[PDB]
Design an enzyme around this catalytic site. Structure first.
Site, PDB file in Angstrom:
ATOM      1  N   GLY A  44       0.702  -4.939   1.914  1.00  0.00           N
ATOM      2  CA  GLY A  44       0.121  -5.726   2.976  1.00  0.00           C
ATOM      3  C   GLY A  44      -1.356  -5.392   3.145  1.00  0.00           C
ATOM      4  O   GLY A  44      -1.819  -4.351   2.679  1.00  0.00           O
ATOM      5  N   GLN A  49      -9.424  -4.527   7.887  1.00  0.00           N
ATOM      6  CA  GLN A  49      -9.515  -3.511   6.799  1.00  0.00           C
ATOM      7  C   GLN A  49     -10.547  -3.857   5.754  1.00  0.00           C
ATOM      8  O   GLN A  49     -10.878  -3.033   4.955  1.00  0.00           O
ATOM      9  CB  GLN A  49      -8.177  -3.361   6.072  1.00  0.00           C
ATOM     10  CG  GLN A  49      -7.140  -2.602   6.839  1.00  0.00           C
ATOM     11  CD  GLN A  49      -5.836  -2.548   6.065  1.00  0.00           C
ATOM     12  OE1 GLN A  49      -5.209  -3.569   5.846  1.00  0.00           O
ATOM     13  NE2 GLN A  49      -5.426  -1.346   5.645  1.00  0.00           N
ATOM     14  N   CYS A  89      -1.720   4.171   4.173  1.00  0.00           N
ATOM     15  CA  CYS A  89      -2.642   3.058   4.473  1.00  0.00           C
ATOM     16  C   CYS A  89      -3.775   3.043   3.485  1.00  0.00           C
ATOM     17  O   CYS A  89      -4.309   4.101   3.170  1.00  0.00           O
ATOM     18  CB  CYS A  89      -3.253   3.271   5.871  1.00  0.00           C
ATOM     19  SG  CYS A  89      -4.018   1.802   6.550  1.00  0.00           S
ATOM     20  N   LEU A  90      -4.167   1.870   3.012  1.00  0.00           N
ATOM     21  CA  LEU A  90      -5.341   1.753   2.125  1.00  0.00           C
ATOM     22  C   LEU A  90      -6.635   2.203   2.830  1.00  0.00           C
ATOM     23  O   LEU A  90      -7.591   2.618   2.183  1.00  0.00           O
ATOM     24  CB  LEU A  90      -5.518   0.311   1.670  1.00  0.00           C
ATOM     25  CG  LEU A  90      -4.468  -0.182   0.663  1.00  0.00           C
ATOM     26  CD1 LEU A  90      -4.579  -1.683   0.510  1.00  0.00           C
ATOM     27  CD2 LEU A  90      -4.606   0.462  -0.710  1.00  0.00           C
ATOM     28  N   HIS A 131       2.957  -2.472  10.847  1.00  0.00           N
ATOM     29  CA  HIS A 131       1.783  -1.770  10.343  1.00  0.00           C
ATOM     30  C   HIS A 131       0.600  -2.755  10.361  1.00  0.00           C
ATOM     31  O   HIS A 131      -0.503  -2.415  10.823  1.00  0.00           O
ATOM     32  CB  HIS A 131       2.068  -1.217   8.929  1.00  0.00           C
ATOM     33  CG  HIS A 131       0.910  -0.510   8.283  1.00  0.00           C
ATOM     34  ND1 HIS A 131       0.839   0.861   8.172  1.00  0.00           N
ATOM     35  CD2 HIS A 131      -0.207  -0.994   7.680  1.00  0.00           C
ATOM     36  CE1 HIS A 131      -0.282   1.189   7.549  1.00  0.00           C
ATOM     37  NE2 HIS A 131      -0.935   0.083   7.249  1.00  0.00           N
ATOM     38  N   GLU A 132       0.819  -3.983   9.908  1.00  0.00           N
ATOM     39  CA  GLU A 132      -0.322  -4.885   9.796  1.00  0.00           C
ATOM     40  C   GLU A 132      -0.828  -5.394  11.148  1.00  0.00           C
ATOM     41  O   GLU A 132      -2.039  -5.510  11.369  1.00  0.00           O
ATOM     42  CB  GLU A 132      -0.050  -6.025   8.828  1.00  0.00           C
ATOM     43  CG  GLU A 132       0.382  -5.574   7.435  1.00  0.00           C
ATOM     44  CD  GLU A 132      -0.613  -4.661   6.712  1.00  0.00           C
ATOM     45  OE1 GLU A 132      -1.811  -4.557   7.113  1.00  0.00           O
ATOM     46  OE2 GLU A 132      -0.199  -4.065   5.686  1.00  0.00           O
ATOM     47  N   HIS A 135      -3.057  -3.080  12.907  1.00  0.00           N
ATOM     48  CA  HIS A 135      -4.429  -3.213  12.412  1.00  0.00           C
ATOM     49  C   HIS A 135      -5.212  -4.201  13.211  1.00  0.00           C
ATOM     50  O   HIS A 135      -6.399  -3.962  13.494  1.00  0.00           O
ATOM     51  CB  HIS A 135      -4.539  -3.585  10.933  1.00  0.00           C
ATOM     52  CG  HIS A 135      -4.424  -2.413  10.006  1.00  0.00           C
ATOM     53  ND1 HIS A 135      -5.378  -1.422   9.935  1.00  0.00           N
ATOM     54  CD2 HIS A 135      -3.481  -2.088   9.094  1.00  0.00           C
ATOM     55  CE1 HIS A 135      -5.018  -0.524   9.032  1.00  0.00           C
ATOM     56  NE2 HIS A 135      -3.868  -0.902   8.512  1.00  0.00           N
TER      57      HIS A 135
HETATM   58  C1  LIG Z   1       4.801   0.802   4.901  1.00  0.00           C
HETATM   59  C2  LIG Z   1       4.168  -0.286   5.749  1.00  0.00           C
HETATM   60  C3  LIG Z   1       3.163  -1.133   4.958  1.00  0.00           C
HETATM   61  C4  LIG Z   1       2.027  -0.301   4.348  1.00  0.00           C
HETATM   62  C5  LIG Z   1       0.849  -1.190   3.938  1.00  0.00           C
HETATM   63  C6  LIG Z   1      -0.222  -0.438   3.141  1.00  0.00           C
HETATM   64  C7  LIG Z   1      -1.422  -1.376   3.018  1.00  0.00           C
HETATM   65  C8  LIG Z   1      -2.299  -1.206   4.260  1.00  0.00           C
HETATM   66  O1  LIG Z   1      -3.059  -0.232   4.394  1.00  0.00           O
HETATM   67  N1  LIG Z   1      -2.162  -2.115   5.222  1.00  0.00           N
HETATM   68  O2  LIG Z   1      -2.804  -1.925   6.433  1.00  0.00           O
HETATM   69  C9  LIG Z   1       0.277  -0.007   1.772  1.00  0.00           C
HETATM   70  O3  LIG Z   1       0.591  -0.848   0.948  1.00  0.00           O
HETATM   71  N2  LIG Z   1       0.387   1.305   1.520  1.00  0.00           N
HETATM   72  C10 LIG Z   1       0.931   1.839   0.269  1.00  0.00           C
HETATM   73  C11 LIG Z   1       2.289   2.473   0.530  1.00  0.00           C
HETATM   74  O4  LIG Z   1       2.361   3.349   1.377  1.00  0.00           O
HETATM   75  N3  LIG Z   1       3.356   1.989  -0.164  1.00  0.00           N
HETATM   76  C12 LIG Z   1       3.302   1.252  -1.444  1.00  0.00           C
HETATM   77  C13 LIG Z   1       4.735   1.118  -1.941  1.00  0.00           C
HETATM   78  C14 LIG Z   1       5.642   1.727  -0.886  1.00  0.00           C
HETATM   79  C15 LIG Z   1       4.762   2.093   0.313  1.00  0.00           C
HETATM   80  C16 LIG Z   1       5.104   3.507   0.803  1.00  0.00           C
HETATM   81  O5  LIG Z   1       4.908   3.556   2.221  1.00  0.00           O
HETATM   82  C17 LIG Z   1      -0.108   2.751  -0.417  1.00  0.00           C
HETATM   83  C18 LIG Z   1       0.241   4.238  -0.470  1.00  0.00           C
HETATM   84  C19 LIG Z   1      -0.418   2.263  -1.836  1.00  0.00           C
HETATM   85 NI    NI Z   2      -2.978  -0.098   6.771  1.00  0.00          NI
END
Ligand SMILES: CCCCC[C@H](CC(=O)NO)C(=O)N[C@H](C(=O)N1CCC[C@H]1CO)C(C)C
Ligand code: NI
Ligand SMILES: CCCCC[C@H](CC(=O)NO)C(=O)N[C@H](C(=O)N1CCC[C@H]1CO)C(C)C
Ligand SMILES: CCCCC[C@H](CC(=O)NO)C(=O)N[C@H](C(=O)N1CCC[C@H]1CO)C(C)C
Ligand SMILES: CCCCC[C@H](CC(=O)NO)C(=O)N[C@H](C(=O)N1CCC[C@H]1CO)C(C)C
Ligand code: NI
Ligand code: NI
Ligand code: NI
Lengths: 164, 164, 165, 162
Positions: A44, A49, A89-90, A131-132, A135
């Site tokens: 997401g 962001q 989070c990114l 989460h989104e 933001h």
């Molecule tokens: C969990 C709720 C949604 C998280 C969204 C975030 C993207 C973001 O920062 N949105 O504000 C993300 O993809 N984060 C990834 C992440 O944490 N991931 C990617 C695959 C599974 C999940 C693990 O929590 C990163 C580490 C690449």
């Molecule tokens: Ni985030």
């Protein structure tokens, strides 16, 4: 690519304006967001962001242009259940936190063509939606930590930003 | 003699963190807030309007200091009815607009020495409480308006801020 | 010469103003000065004696955006109904408000900026402002509905204030 | 000394008296004295440049039925009537003023004691005239704008003349 803001940054803490009109300019922002999101391996992305202070969210849980959601001016109408996974989070690279979320969520929002829709979600979708939306209201996952923990994260990310 | 933020400002759109500790420093901030409120001829004031991003509100409807209200970490317990008055804000100088509000409200909050209290309010007081708690969630009265009206006010104030 | 306002206490804030004989352009210039003064001081209403003109002139704009400017010259309330109260403030009495007993709806006849006669039904805040400003035209302030004690206390703060500004 | 129209203090809504003390009672007596010297049957403090709610009436002229009204207020009033009213602050002019015929009035007397009085005819008329003064209203304010203007202008020129 658009530039992803890294915490700390003021525009990561701002409650965003609703989109007045989902038009071509908005839809380019949506497509540009999808690009950046996929480039960064996000599931997401929220507009602030990438320094756009509007209520626009792109999601793709499974990450393959399958179930692509666009949520513009979204609102949680109803929720239920209790859950919480370790979230990253990114905009906060290198950190995770267990965040208490609702298991199930029902959301209203405009799609990329400006049509209202209502969506019931659970599991990962539900959590990603939450989460989104945080933001969009200038809330990050660190905001569920102790002020002390959050501070230590901040210091470290400051280092990483001069370093990068 | 703290300065009031003028809309648009990023920090007028921030969700403020709970005060963790109602100590002498928080009390100093309270007294400074009252001073500013009195100097600026307001009847209420939220910490973000003086750029302090914490959940602190000062109110005095009559302005003679007989009935000062300090609301730390406030939560509306319940509310009912409907009203609205053309509302103004020190952070949105020169402009007022009717905002849909609850007529009556019950809030809990911490006072100046961190002692819990509950307050029931109607009339103007109830309205101010809602408006000020709105500031604490990074919400301004112009966010209830059409984006068109909100935009005009934004434009005219960016002009005014340049003049300052 | 600045867009300033008489501050309580001052004699001219208790003077009963005389009707405008004709809406000419000394008067329209007074009207535009009043609006600017209202807007400068972030007020929603104003009456001529507040900028030291002893004439029956009132300018109101509840929203501030100029989209609904009312001008009322030689006003009179034809009728009114009900009662209401809100803690009212006044640019001539800065830093204070008090609930003043008012009529809820009011019907006012007056002259506009051109000298042309209108009738206006008003309620809510508008109706309260109309009444508040008409009181000014009749040498009445909100503090005159309070108790000698409350008013004397206000006077005393305000002398002090006037000095310091 | 009696103020002559035009003057801003003849248009000022007067302050209530808080204590009927001796300063006030001298005022009251100084007012009767001035009223009689100048050949009036009523007088209001602002007419002598005292911006307080104090009225001195004597319709008889004989110091017999003297009325003192401090912080008066009208509670009831009925009927219409009229008379060619003059005013010591507006010498050389009269006007027919539509008045209430009967009036009920509560005020403090010379020693600050409350009383309520029903009045009619001339008393009632002067009471109205004299309360008008405490509210910054003169008899000429019941006239057309030009007529008021005319009198104001003559009295401005009369005022210089001494
Ligand atoms: C969990 C709720 C949604 C998280 C969204 C975030 C993207 C973001 O920062 N949105 O504000 C993300 O993809 N984060 C990834 C992440 O944490 N991931 C990617 C695959 C599974 C999940 C693990 O929590 C990163 C580490 C690449
Ligand atoms: Ni985030
Ligand atoms: C109105 C409800 C409370 C709003 C609070 C504001 C102060 C503020 O900026 N709070 O964040 C206020 O004092 N507003 C005043 C105001 O505009 N008021 C006072 C009465 C109601 C409203 C305008 O009708 C200004 C002009 C000083
Ligand atoms: C509302 C009654 C009409 C008063 C209008 C005044 C301006 C004035 O002094 N008129 O004589 C005003 O703008 N008052 C404001 C005010 O205090 N208000 C706004 C609405 C009600 C009242 C306080 O609650 C000030 C502080 C800017
Ligand atoms: C009846 C209304 C009260 C008027 C009383 C006045 C005195 C005054 O100036 N009152 O404010 C008066 O006696 N004026 C005299 C006058 O002309 N008359 C005759 C008696 C009263 C008045 C006519 O009303 C003077 C000018 C000679
Ligand atoms: Ni505000
Ligand atoms: Ni006023
Ligand atoms: Ni007289």
């Amino acid at each position: 690519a658009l530039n992803v803001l890294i915490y700390p940054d003021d525009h990561l803490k701002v409650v965003c304006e609703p989109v007045t009109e989902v038009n071509d300019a908005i839809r380019k922002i949506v497509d540009d967001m999808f690009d950046t999101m996929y480039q960064e391996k996000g599931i997401g992305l929220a507009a602030p962001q990438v320094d756009i202070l509007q209520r626009i969210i792109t999601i793709d849980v499974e990450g393959d242009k399958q179930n692509q959601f666009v949520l513009i001016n979204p609102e949680i109408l109803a929720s239920e259940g209790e859950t919480g996974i370790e979230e990253g989070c990114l905009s906060i690279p290198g950190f995770r936190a267990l965040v208490p979320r609702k298991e199930k969520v029902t959301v209203r929002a405009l799609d990329r063509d400006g049509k209202e829709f209502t969506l019931d979600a659970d599991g990962l979708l539900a959590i990603c939606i939450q989460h989104e939306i945080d933001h969009l209201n200038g809330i990050l996952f660190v905001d569920y930590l102790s002020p002390l923990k959050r501070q230590r994260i901040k210091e470290k990310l400051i280092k990483y930003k001069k370093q990068i």
